[PDB]
């Protein structure tokens, strides 16, 4: 569904009218309606990501680590490469796997979590996925995929 609409959809409280009105303003400028959110996986909200009191930036970075049990299937950070490439990263300032944190840390996302709540916020990032134009915001975690894209689940007739 639409990113903007998603906010009003998972809104825990309607009292956030002012927050939604201002938050929705991003639709014009700020990839508000340009983002599509959908459920990529069917899971449940953990009690360890809601009980503890985390901070905005802290929760964002901490949450990423929650679903980051494995990095890469092949050897990673085996060795260091010397060259001008490092200069590029130092000058241009290359970002790591915590790139999503920058977008999530944005004030716009602060309202979302507030409106949808933590349980929905975590679920949205873990259970669901966000699509921004030609790039994935949440970031797909499908690595087990060998050759096939998705698997067809068993059909469920009517009772």
Automatic annotation (TrEMBL):
It is found in: Nucleus; Chromosome, Telomere. Signal peptide: none annotated. It comes from the Eukaryota. Belongs to the reverse transcriptase family. Telomerase subfamily. Telomerase is a ribonucleoprotein enzyme essential for the replication of chromosome termini in most eukaryotes. It elongates telomeres. It is a reverse transcriptase that adds simple sequence repeats to chromosome ends by copying a template sequence within the RNA component of the enzyme. This is Telomerase reverse transcriptase. The lineage of its organism: Eukaryota, Fungi, Dikarya, Ascomycota, Saccharomycotina. The chain holds residues 1 to 154 of 782 of the full protein.
């Amino acid at each position: 569904m639409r990113f903007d609409q998603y906010v009003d959809e998972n809104k825990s409280s309607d009292d956030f009218e002012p927050l939604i009105h201002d938050l929705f303003e991003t639709r014009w400028h700020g990839t508000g309606r340009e983002i599509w959110i959908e459920r990529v996986k069917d899971r449940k909200i953990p009690s360890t990501l809601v009980k503890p009191n985390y901070s905005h930036e802290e929760l964002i970075d901490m949450l990423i680590g929650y679903l980051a049990d494995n990095r890469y299937e092949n050897a990673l950070i085996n060795g260091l490469v010397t060259g001008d490439d490092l200069e590029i990263a130092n000058s241009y300032g290359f970002k790591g796997r915590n790139a999503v944190t920058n977008l999530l840390k944005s004030p716009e996302f602060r309202l979302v979590h507030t409106i949808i709540g933590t349980e929905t916020f975590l679920d949205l990032l873990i259970n669901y996925s966000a699509r921004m134009g030609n790039v994935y915001l949440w970031g797909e975690l499908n690595e087990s995929n060998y050759k096939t894209q998705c698997k067809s689940s068993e059909n469920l007739y009517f009772q």
